[PDB]
């Protein structure tokens, strides 16, 4: 049903469980959530998949010339 609170809770659970496949499914099927805060939280998870998903969300928010400089590190 694309509920904002449900999406945020599922994203937080996936962050806690260190899952990135269900996170990919959620971000590809639904978009009713704050992508900026989620990306800022994923980029500090010390994992490569989490920062890649953060850059994917940043590029999906049409934040060009920003996600590339972020992943350049």
């Amino acid at each position: 049903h694309n509920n904002k609170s449900v999406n945020e809770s599922l994203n937080n659970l996936f962050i806690t469980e260190e899952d990135y496949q269900a996170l990919r499914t959620s971000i590809d099927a639904y978009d009713n959530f704050d992508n900026i805060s989620l990306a800022q939280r994923l980029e500090k998870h010390e994992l490569i998949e989490f920062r890649r998903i953060a850059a994917y969300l940043f590029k999906g928010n049409n934040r060009w010339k920003q996600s590339v400089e972020l992943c350049k590190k």
Binding site: I36, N61, N62, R63
Partner: protein, 73 residues
């Protein structure tokens, strides 16, 4: 939130509303970026009137150069 919502979508009306909001808030420096992505030559009189309140004659030049190719005044 308005900047992120404008980055998500793509419409000159949203950038024009953002420019009007920045002019109401006195942000002359940020008002030029709201017209570069919109290419709206209208309301130039208010932009010029607000430019005198704060010296920002580095971005208004490009705004006027782009408006020249839209309204030969």
């Amino acid at each position: 939130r308005a900047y992120e919502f404008a980055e998500r979508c793509n419409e000159p009306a949203v950038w024009s509303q953002l420019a009007k909001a920045q002019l109401q808030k006195g942000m002359v420096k940020e008002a030029i970026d709201s017209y570069i992505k919109a290419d709206d030559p209208s309301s130039y009189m208010e932009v010029v009137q607000a430019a005198n309140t704060s010296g920002n004659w580095e971005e208004l030049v490009k705004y006027l150069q782009m408006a020249r190719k839209k309204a030969r005044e």
